[PDB]
Design a protein around this nucleic acid. Structure first.
Lengths: 188, 143, 161, 261
RNA sequence: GAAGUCGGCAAAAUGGAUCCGUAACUUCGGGAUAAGGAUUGGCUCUAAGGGUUGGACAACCAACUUAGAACU
RNA sequence: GUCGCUACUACCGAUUGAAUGGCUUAGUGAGGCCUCUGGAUUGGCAUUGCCGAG
RNA sequence: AACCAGGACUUUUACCUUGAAAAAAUUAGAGUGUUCAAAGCAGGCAAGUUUUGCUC
RNA sequence: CUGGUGCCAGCAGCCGCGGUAAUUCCAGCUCCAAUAGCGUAUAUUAAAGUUGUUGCAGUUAAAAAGCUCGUAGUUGAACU
RNA sequence: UACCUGGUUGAUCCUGCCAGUAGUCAUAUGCUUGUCUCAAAGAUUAAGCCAUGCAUGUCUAAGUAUAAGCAAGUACUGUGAAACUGCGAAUGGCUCAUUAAAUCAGUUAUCGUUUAUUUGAUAGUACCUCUACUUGGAUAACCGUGGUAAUUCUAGAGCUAAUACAUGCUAAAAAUCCCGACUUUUUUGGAAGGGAUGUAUUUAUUAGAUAAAAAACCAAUGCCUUCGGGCUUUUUUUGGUGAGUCAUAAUAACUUUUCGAAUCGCAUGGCCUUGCGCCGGCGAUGGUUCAUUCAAAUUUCUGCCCUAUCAACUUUCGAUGGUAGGAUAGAGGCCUACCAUGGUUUUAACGGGUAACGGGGAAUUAGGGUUCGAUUCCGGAGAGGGAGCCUGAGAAACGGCUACCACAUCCAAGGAAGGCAGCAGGCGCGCAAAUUACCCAAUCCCGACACGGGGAGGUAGUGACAAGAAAUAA
């Protein structure tokens, strides 16, 4: 199997280490699960201690969070936008953590309309007072407002698809969003 | 070593679980006291680097043995080599002999390290195949 | 060599058999073996065949059709024994067993007709067990809430003092 | 190696068990339980090599399986049950109660407490923290968990149990002028009073203890067990009471007893 | 597969470039392209290496290389 | 000391040196595992193709 | 302020003393009459009731 | 001490004996050290102050480099 | 037990070596050989090859049952074969081939992780806005029955159970939040009736104050006096370590929504609309989470024979460090993509030999030193050589399996297939090492278990030797 020990590599002095013992189960490795965008497929691989790991081979409809108002919604994935570790992985659309992706912004738009009340890009006195007593913080950044109009939201994944079997993350804003757009603008 | 832009990698460098919003100007800076009497440097308190592998403003913890050595090779990024000098006793001749062993440690940007610069380090879990220590105190040869 | 369902090629092939696969009972749980089994389509190499019949022919076969063999083992589960004889909720199902003679077992007299055991029943023993479980569960809950109230009072007087 | 070991060895057993070098090649190998395997006395050893109520493994198994020996108020049918420090082995058949305490030399001796003074047990709490629903709980040295403790109880405090109704009866803090009995090292089994406490960051802590006969020593924190207050030991200490008479003191005493007695 | 022939005569085989590796001997300069191995298309990309120029930067214009990857 | 003479040792050694075990060189490559298909049969649906296990 | 007492006081040591912590077996060695001994960790009372036990 | 061979047979760890007077060759006798043990071979230790830190030796017995500079290394005047 | 002796020379004093001398579970051998007690015994070479037999099975009153089994109440009522089921099989035992900061020894860390079992706590929560409360389908065993020279080879045919398998309120009262019968001050408005809020995973956010003590305001809005607005011991959460994004709780969502006993045994105890109605103590086996215990896994510092006629080694296809990702139970260049050229070394790096498993320890004994450790204990590796994997908490297991190589093997020439460095025993290499014996009685181990098994272990049998005591006499 895939070995994970340090006994096979050379020492810090450069000398290789002679064989000491055979491969052991408690230091094994497994084939990487290059999950891609598609219909859900989750495998339940047995793990040391009698536990189970959710191997993901294709994921969709992840859970992404909007930190400006502290909300989280189930939004569908589209494709990988930019993977810092390797341009090959984003090119082939493989889902990992810290890999920017595109998600549907419509659930965020409808939630914003139902919460704040005011229209974006334009009776019921209780609804009026609820939507007028929470004003002030209704202003939203233009850099991400453009992507809201474009219908696709840039998001970064924090969960590990190959370990927990889930696709969770949050969308970017501020300097975190600006740095990635600046890096990826010449690329596209 | 040299203060460059903190965004010098292919990814975005940010402190985990540190958030920015509108009601509060940007966000906060997180730091912890490594304990055992070592004080967090003021540069770490008010700085800009990330250094996930740093005893301060990071996630590694100092526990185990605390050692002191002299810098011999600081030609690696955020990592230096220190030399420990000690006398080994040979019972047959009832005498001693010089023995040395090189130790690799990780260094925060809050410390400026050159040749000499007696550094006190503490065990902070393996970092990459050789580095199990982090520099906590510096005795500068110039000050 | 038995022929294995699935192998289209009409020749014996050695494959890694599992516990769930037929023609092999593993010595240890999880033990996988390799054995040679034939294919699916019959040819000129097989020696015996097994047939399943549905309809009867115009002529009457004396060895198969003319001879009938009844069944010996009846239903055991509650649902099976209810559906076998179509008994309602109150129909005295406990007296619906089949009587058999075992006299030649050297019993001599009293021709005992041993009956199979019945599971998934409504015997008072399981009712006693159920009420015991519910009793202890209620006692634990009552003890927990009483301890919560006592500690809340203790915390209230401690912060007061 | 390649799995947990299930066989111990005579010579590899703890020295304080006082097992003969010959007449057997295997040792009891205590089963998992409240106490560590290196700080426990198996029930078979207690009932055979200490009380001598049984002579063989078959005999001790019959005694235990008759449901007569009870530890901490509960009957134990395990042969190699790990009965450690401060355990109340209650023999309800004869009507005797034993409290496992260290001897003058640290070995697990035989102590006999009455029917009263056997329905309680002192536990040194190992850690106190709040668990699920925010409720507080403490874990003790014998692997016991107690919910909803007193807020005054902190780390290294000795609490009193009941063993038939549970709950804390009394608590003793860890500070100066507290009776403590050493449960480890070269002074295990010695009883005295805390005098001075040192402080080490990231390492063990030193506690200085003075006995009743004006002798001062030092020991690690993990070896210190609080047993009561000054002038009032909450347990019945065995003969010797942790004074640690030297070899010369033992010699002249033994000579004094010898003859007519 | 040189058994032909005095004789490998003639012919065949090798061949460019990139990356490994290269012995005896030596006048230390060589032998050496020693010998012996691998790759090479098309398409789509990635990264790095330079010029003037509008208010840490910058939208152009004007440029050729190198290295790597996927697919076929 | 020389040759003469006897048993024995070691080195070099043409013979383009051979052979046992390791280190490599280029190709080939069984078997298990993961992964894409795959569909004897089953499988809820006289009734129909759909989740499918496979 | 400092004057008294208490917590830390090695800049950093080597060196010496002591303490904590740390397998048993082994060795030295304490005690005890395997008839001595190599051994073993047992054992002892009491010579008139043979003692519903005690003591290392 | 006695019979047989006589630089031969042979002993013989070493010296050494054996060319007719053989205390050492092979036979008898006696004694010696050990004793249910004695001997032989090999590996090791003490011997070996012949591996020397304690604790060797270097003019002539084995050994001061042809001389000088000088880095790691070792050693480093007195005083608080 | 601080020790000598012979030998170069005509003779002497030295340097110097040879030989003598004494010890060694230190081995073999020649001669000889009455006892008792006690301990080792195919390690030295061939980690060479093996006929045969055994060495891992296990059931209590308390998991499952018509044997067409047995001594004997018309669901069973006793015993009892086999089978399904749960666990162990990863312990024990043997060998030292490989192995040179590797193993190992002392000493740290896991705030960098897993753990079946044992121990203590932990669990009224799901569903209906018409749900069986005791639930659905096969099957072993059983009855017939075939192929093959053979195997612990099994299909086809008929049935039947679970503490295996696949689903599902058993529990009320009752608070808050979402929808809203209805919405103006009725302080700042929230509620009939409908559901959820248990718990677990993942993501993001927040509270997580306390060495104290005096003030100027803005929005939601708790006690409301006496609406000037006051505005408190306090609701404001709360706890620990040297240190944490630790614990804990809340907020907004997700989940092939993990768990929330469809289970058994012993005692017939009390009553009144008298239905055979409610009801009762002591246990056993499962199952969620945490802690504990038994273990594994990495890991900090120092210490390992000889060799320089080994002086430089590693950097491709990872060598040094950084970033990101994947994989692992978890840290980590363990792996991947990119970025810089780094890391060790005369204090001996690297390479080579080892006739090298390491240590506690053993032999010699003034002190200091020298040699050995295959071997009754601890740790490591292995089951001819590597490689791969299932089950299982735990195996890269070999008295588990798969593939290749070298051996050997029955053969109807189609095929099955095997591993004594486990206990006895056999061949060969050998200077060198024993019975194809008895027993679970003692020690302990495993199991469903007071009872079964254990070539572990104990007991004996043969030997020239390892040790202790004295008979051949007076």
């Amino acid at each position: 199997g895939i070995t994970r020990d340090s006994r096979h590599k050379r020492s810090a002095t450069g000398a290789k280490r002679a064989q000491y013992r055979k491969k052991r189960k408690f230091e094994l490795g497994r084939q990487p699960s290059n999950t891609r965008i598609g219909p859900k497929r989750i495998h339940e691989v047995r793990v040391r201690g009698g536990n189970k790991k959710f191997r993901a081979l294709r994921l969709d409809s992840g859970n992404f969070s909007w930190g400006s108002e502290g909300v989280s919604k189930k939004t569908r994935i589209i494709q990988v936008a930019y993977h810092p570790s390797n341009n090959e992985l984003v090119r082939t659309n493989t889902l990992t953590k810290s890999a920017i992706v595109q998600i549907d912004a419509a659930p965020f738009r409808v939630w914003y309309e139902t919460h704040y009340g005011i229209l974006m890009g334009s009776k019921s006195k209780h609804v009026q007072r609820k939507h007028s007593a929470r004003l002030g913080d209704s202003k939203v950044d233009s850099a991400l407002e453009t992507q809201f109009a474009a219908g696709r939201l840039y998001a970064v994944v924090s969960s590990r698809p190959g370990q927990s079997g889930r696709c969770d993350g949050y969308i970017l804003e501020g300097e975190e969003l600006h740095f990635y757009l600046r890096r990826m603008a010449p690329k596209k | 070593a040299t203060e460059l832009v903190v965004q010098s990698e292919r990814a975005f460098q940010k402190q985990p679980h540190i958030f920015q919003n509108a009601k509060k100007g940007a966000g906060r800076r997180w730091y912890k006291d490594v304990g055992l009497g070592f004080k967090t440097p003021a540069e770490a308190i008010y700085g800009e680097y990330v250094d996930k592998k740093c005893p301060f403003v990071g996630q590694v913890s100092i526990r185990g043995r605390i050692l002191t050595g002299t810098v011999v090779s600081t030609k690696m990024h955020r990592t230096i080599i220190i030399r420990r000098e000690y006398l080994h006793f040979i019972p047959k001749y009832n005498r001693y002999e010089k023995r040395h062993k090189n130790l690799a440690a990780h260094v925060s940007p809050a410390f400026r390290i050159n040749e000499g610069d007696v550094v006190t380090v503490g065990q902070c879990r393996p970092l990459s195949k050789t580095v199990r220590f982090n520099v906590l105190r510096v005795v500068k040869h110039t000050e | 060599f038995p022929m294995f369902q699935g192998v289209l090629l009409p020749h014996r092939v050695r494959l890694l058999l599992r516990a769930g696969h037929p023609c092999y009972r593993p010595r240890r749980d999880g033990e996988r073996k390799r054995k040679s089994v034939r294919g699916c389509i019959v040819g000129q190499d097989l020696a015996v065949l097994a047939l399943a019949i549905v309809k009867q022919g115009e002529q009457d076969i004396p060895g198969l059709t003319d001879v009938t063999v009844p069944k010996r083992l009846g239903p055991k589960r509650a649902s099976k024994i209810r559906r076998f004889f179509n008994l309602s909720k109150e129909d005295d199902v406990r007296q619906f067993v089949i009587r058999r003679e075992v006299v030649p077992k050297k019993e001599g007299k009293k021709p005992y007709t041993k009956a199979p055991k019945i599971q998934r029943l409504v015997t008072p023993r399981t009712l006693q067990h159920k009420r015991h479980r519910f009793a202890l569960k209620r006692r634990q809950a009552e003890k927990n809430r009483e301890e919560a109230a006592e500690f809340a009072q203790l915390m209230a007087k401690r912060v007061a003092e | 190696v390649r799995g947990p070991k299930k066989h111990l060895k005579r010579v590899a057993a703890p020295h304080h068990w006082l097992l003969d070098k010959l007449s057997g090649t295997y040792a009891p190998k205590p089963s998992p339980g409240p106490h560590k395997a290196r700080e426990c006395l198996p029930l078979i050893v207690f009932l055979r090599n200490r009380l001598k109520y049984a002579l063989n493994g078959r005999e001790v198994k019959a005694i235990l399986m008759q449901r007569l020996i009870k530890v901490d108020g509960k009957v134990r049918t395990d042969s190699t049950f790990p009965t450690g420090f401060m355990d109340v082995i209650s023999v309800d058949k004869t009507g005797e109660h034993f409290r496992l305490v260290y001897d003058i030399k640290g070995r697990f001796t035989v102590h006999r407490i009455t029917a009263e003074e056997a329905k309680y047990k002192l536990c040194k709490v190992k850690r106190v923290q709040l668990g699920a629903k925010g409720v507080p709980f403490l874990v003790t040295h014998d692997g016991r968990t107690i919910r909803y403790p007193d807020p005054l109880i902190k780390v290294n405090d000795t609490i009193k149990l009941n063993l038939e109704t549970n709950k804390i009866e009394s608590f003793i803090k860890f500070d100066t002028s507290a009776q403590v009995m050493v449960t480890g090292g070269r002074n295990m089994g010695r009883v005295g009073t805390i005098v001075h406490r040192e402080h080490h960051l990231g390492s063990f802590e030193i506690i200085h203890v003075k006995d009743a006969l004006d002798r001062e020593f030092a020991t690690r924190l993990s070896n210190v067990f609080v047993i009561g207050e000054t002038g009032k030991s909450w347990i019945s200490l065995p003969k010797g009471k942790g004074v640690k008479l030297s070899i010369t003191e033992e010699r002249d005493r033994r000579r004094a007893l010898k003859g007519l007695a």
